[PDB]
Symmetry: D2
């Protein structure tokens, strides 16, 4: 509710009497179901791999490298030019594209077979003998959707015609085998660089520096413990009339150096790929000041004149590759690659900070009036101690319901002795630590008072739910009062909980978390012989 | 050359005599070959598509969307669950992966055929009958490179063994056909979203907002005038217990709204994909205040409960897709998609600003001393006018060469009348406009003096090369003087150019640009009867 | 040098004989002065504070906050409205702007004083009695530069007039005191937020979320050990008809949570600023998993209705501030703030990786021919061992100099016994570790062979310079040969070094690093009794 | 400098500590409210001393 200017402003000017210290209201806490930790924040969360890409992509740009986009699909021949007599071995790890072919059932072999199948279906076929209408096959194939044959302005027909030409027919169509092609995916911007280079050297002026961080597919065939089938390669190439492996080392440094890496070094690669001038293919191991043993993040080399020759390139080229997902794991400290590339496909651990915001309140008054009464009734209960009952706390509010219904006397006390006016606690914060749910009053004992570093604010780990016992307890009470004014009840005082958990004192829990609490042997120590039946009549 | 502090500082303090106005030197112009436009700047250039991705990726994050990475390769069955009886039509545009299979030549059919091929080669085979050694095939296939069999510490062998098992053998290996699989690529994060969703709804707490801008492959089979085979889809999904098409419209707005788009609107899609609840698939046409007719940038819908059911999802999902390359063209105003995705694969037009930096100087003194003499000799020539010759400008410098060689008298004048002391110009800037090369003195004529808006600084388009006639001309002269002190020449005065172009006055041109100038009917109007033989002896 | 296509391509096709393995050349290592570590990479380096700003600025945007720019300079009165009776204490830390005032020397007091100073100078004053010309003072003050009075088309005058009206005059002008004003800088976007709010609440529709990370000036008067005079405040404000301190806690979380912070918590601020509703000003301490004890990164509160009233704001406001430089230090692990805000103003430590690239080669052949000879001559020296001399390695190359000058017999050997043909090393890499310069051959000894983890590639820390002894040594020799063909020398064999450092074997060092090596007690252990006088005649 | 702002802060009006030789027995309490405790002149000498 918005407040008035002068209404409050007057408390100032010249008539300033406890103005500031007052007016604290005008801004009430929006219920308890939205008071945080129950109230969480929202913000776009960038994926670790994609972010790492947007960082490298930026890493190069700051080195002056020109961003490119190499062809993703290359022809089997293009790899022969680069690798050569070796390609016949590398292709072992390359996927080949394929599509809807031709089973060669006719149009050539159809000389002694065609008078067999003349309608292998059992439904309706409007119109008559109008053989063929959509000759849109190999003549400008204009298709891709359904709604093949229909109807418009007429009657008794509807939008439907020929939506059944399979199932109980076409035996050799479900097992149809799309014939392969000479078009294959790739691996490393290299198989693309040449192409992107061949027809670029004579169009631009050297020296030339280029980079392209895109996808690639390294055929591994099912690998849940050794990368996947498609990774991101942060490659680049340096076209220079005078370049060597050194131009590669420097790049690898200037690149890693932008992530806080100071220790890496290089070591000759045994693979000695034949598309690389001999003795240049050097691996680039990296070890960032933290976990992740010296792991290979990159690998670069020089394009052998022979290979560059086949592409009509009259100048040496240096190429450095860097596995994005590789460096990715090092950055965010990830072990299982899969668990990173696809964050949500397994884990989902809920941190203590989350649990707190998942320990909601069971029942509460659904009437702003009563709700307010609760809070008010709660601050009241904060009084006295033991006395084996009774007291003098009965006379209470008398607000209306639907018509004159009021006079709701609520008496509060603790009949059972040694439990104060309400108990030796009723002020337990109910914190959350190491996945466990505790909650203890700011007092002291001696036995389990070792959980100091645990829970409790100040300099003691653990997140609070900002909910004391009495809170849920009273809300439970006031809730009932409400549930009664509609059920026609005159008296109260109830009981139901028994040694179990934090039930009672209200506070329920979302499925998740509760699925973890028990799924990981977490304890929920609260303990509360509340009861506080406390007689409350409505007359 | 670095200067001295006090040396210059003294000219101040209390003895301040034209100090500032002087000391202009100490900072000489680094030659003429590096004086700009010849001196161009370098900076990383981000690709239009990738940048657009880094913008959208950021567009979502600012809307609170969570970044993900959906599986790129899905099984043929996963599409059946989403599409269903329709998938048998959409698969028409989906590539299937494949690799090194088994021709079924033996290990099953090998019962009456094996005593035929026992060595189809004609070279060397070290050692003896040691049939098989690397049984690393179907038993933990540890391969991928060459260097198969080698040698280490010994003599007479070298690193080479068995690098020939084809060519003149294996007839059915080059035509080998990698058998297909049940693994196919995809199209739209959708075919991935379900998967990424199915096993995520019960791990997280709703509502749920996710996005992933990654690659996809829409089988089109050779399309140079209709997208390619792999595009980028900026998709997203909103998991909410209460969502509808509206949640899609809003996204499309909040998304496009971050690019300056205010006009878009939506229209129902006729395709009515069956993996979308009926009457939800609405296209999202966009028209940014500029070129590019109202073009479809997005398209969203709602996942039909049936489809979501097959994936064990108990809640509606809204999915909005946006073609990155699509919006890409609208942003950078591109027509041909290909010409954008792969910038350098055709065009490379050189803007006037480039030409200027490509109009270099033909010949120049290779001796700092002479070079300096040129510049000095150039400012000198700036004198007098006509006189049908002669004058009194002979006595000149006398610097050393390799030993006492000096006394180089250089006389300057214009023998032919009506050509001033050098000419009615010799101060032509040589500008570049509309791809043409002009250059005219700051004087006036009357005929072609219409090219005012063209060339010339101030408020008249066109880029200058900052090179006057005399410049190249004198450099040409001084150059010769130099070329002579080594050739043993005593006199000079030469001639060679004739009505052609800007030859003479030096200034040559790089292959490119010159390939355009003529390749696009550009004119090179300079015209210069220089000659200035000007006698110059060295004794 | 560019190579030919077919020239190399022919080695393939069908005539493939050691093609790949060959052609290794065509790409020579560009000298040794540019072979890395001597060859370092370059890339724009973002300042830690500014980057942190570009991260927070992005942190908010991802939370939906609207970016603003609050006024930097506010009037003394604006702070009174916010703070009130307290402002009279806070202003103690606020700078006040000031400019060229009026000493009140006349125009009011000029009644009995004006006939005193009528020209307190001793130079020239062109023209005559033309009292005043530029009445551009308080009447549209159009000034700001010099070139006050000048001259154009004429003779005997030059661009200069009245450039002297001080020094030997105006006694009370150098000590001139610019009078203060009611305009002061600020501290925290707060003093700006109100203003930015007051005239914004009725223009926009609530709720309202805003943020602005800009500068602020907290008067501390010289603080080299307690922040400076101007810091960056990453503040924000949430205008909501229903907001409380909680809306602040959540922000602080959603903000820090985007830096990897999971531990922070809040604690009530004792300061209890009166411009904040009582009991809301809560500090926000943060402890990132690393160094930097629990340090206060933020602090937020609620604007007291009274203060908001004075600005005509009819609704509570939540404000959270965050010291950028504060979080900055935590991120990049900085102790001294100054050492961060102004990176280069003290330190500049050169990491080992740098030293390597600063250990250049003393002297080298300045003739491509000789240079090449060196490298060739170097691989040659790699032969034999001890023999107390001599051998059979004299006959050598015979290339031309300036004319027939050739036949340069270079004999190589080690006269002194127990030093092999050259020495028991001459292959020392010369590494760099812990700021020290070592370098040892890949052999072994037993005494100091404890520096294994030190230097040496593989899995042993330390950066190499990729320079062996012989390298510098031979370059030194070949260098001489060259220096001789011009000095007219016939024989050689020299000596000059003695127990000192790595001198000899060439290799010098840049001033810096060498300033550190000794400035921090670093050792340079090489030790080399080279000598290798090796007789070399030129006839 | 004609276009440059100069910083400034709480100065000293030079009312005493130097000119206080014939003026100090004038203002000994220019207020009309409460002042707890008694004659305990000064307690927070936190001015020019840290």
């Amino acid at each position: 509710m918005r407040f008035d200017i002068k209404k409050v402003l007057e408390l100032a000017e010249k008539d300033f009497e406890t103005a500031w210290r007052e007016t604290r209201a005008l801004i009430k806490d929006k219920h308890i179901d939205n008071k945080y930790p129950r109230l969480k924040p929202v913000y776009g969360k960038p994926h670790p791999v994609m972010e790492t890409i947007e960082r490298l992509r930026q890493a190069y740009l700051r080195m002056g490298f020109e961003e490119m986009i190499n062809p993703v699909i290359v022809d089997e021949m293009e790899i022969y030019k680069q690798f050569g007599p070796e390609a016949m071995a590398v292709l072992d790890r390359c996927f080949y594209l394929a599509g809807l072919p031709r089973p060669d059932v006719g149009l050539g072999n159809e000389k002694v077979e065609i008078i067999k199948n003349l309608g292998i279906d059992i439904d309706e076929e409007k119109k008559e003998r109008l053989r063929e209408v959509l000759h849109l096959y190999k003549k400008g194939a204009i298709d891709g959707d359904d709604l093949v044959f229909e109807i418009a302005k007429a009657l008794n027909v509807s939008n439907e015609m020929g939506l059944k030409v399979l199932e109980t027919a076409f035996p050799e169509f479900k097992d149809l085998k799309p014939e392969s092609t000479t078009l294959t995916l790739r691996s490393h911007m290299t198989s693309g660089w040449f192409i992107t280079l061949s027809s670029l050297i004579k169009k631009r002026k050297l020296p030339l520096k280029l980079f392209s961080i895109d996808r690639c597919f390294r055929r591994e065939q099912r690998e849940d413990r050794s990368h996947l089938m498609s990774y991101h390669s942060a490659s680049c190439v340096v076209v220079g009339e005078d370049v060597s492996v050194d131009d590669g080392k420097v790049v690898a440094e200037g690149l890693l150096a932008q992530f806080g890496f100071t220790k890496f070094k290089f070591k000759p690669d045994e693979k000695k790929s034949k598309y690389y001038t001999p003795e240049t293919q050097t691996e680039v191991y990296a070890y960032h000041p933290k976990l992740g043993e010296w792991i290979e993040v990159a690998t670069f080399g020089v394009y052998s004149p022979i290979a560059l020759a086949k592409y009509n390139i009259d100048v040496p080229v240096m190429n450095l590759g860097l596995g994005v997902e590789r460096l990715a794991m090092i950055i965010y400290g990830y072990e299982d690659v899969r668990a990173m590339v696809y964050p949500q496909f397994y884990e989902y651990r809920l941190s203590d900070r989350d649990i707190a915001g998942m320990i909601r309140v069971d029942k509460v008054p659904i009437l702003d009036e009563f709700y307010n009464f609760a809070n008010e009734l709660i601050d009241i209960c904060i009084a006295n101690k033991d006395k084996e009952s009774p007291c003098s706390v009965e006379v209470k509010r008398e607000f209306n319901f639907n018509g004159e219904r009021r006079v709701i006397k609520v008496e509060i006390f603790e009949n059972e002795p040694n439990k104060k006016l309400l108990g030796p606690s009723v002020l337990n914060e109910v914190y959350v630590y190491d996945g466990n749910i505790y909650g203890i009053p700011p007092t002291f004992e001696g036995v389990k008072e070792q959980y100091i570093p645990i829970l409790k604010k100040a300099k003691e780990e653990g997140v609070s739910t900002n909910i004391r016992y009495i809170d849920g307890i009273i809300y439970k009470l006031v809730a009932k009062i409400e549930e009664a004014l509609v059920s026609n009840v005159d008296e109260f005082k109830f009981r139901v909980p028994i040694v179990r958990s934090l039930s009672d004192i209200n506070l329920k829990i979302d499925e998740l978390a509760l699925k973890q609490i028990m799924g990981e042997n977490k304890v929920i120590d609260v303990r509360g012989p509340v009861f506080l039946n406390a007689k409350v009549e409505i007359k």
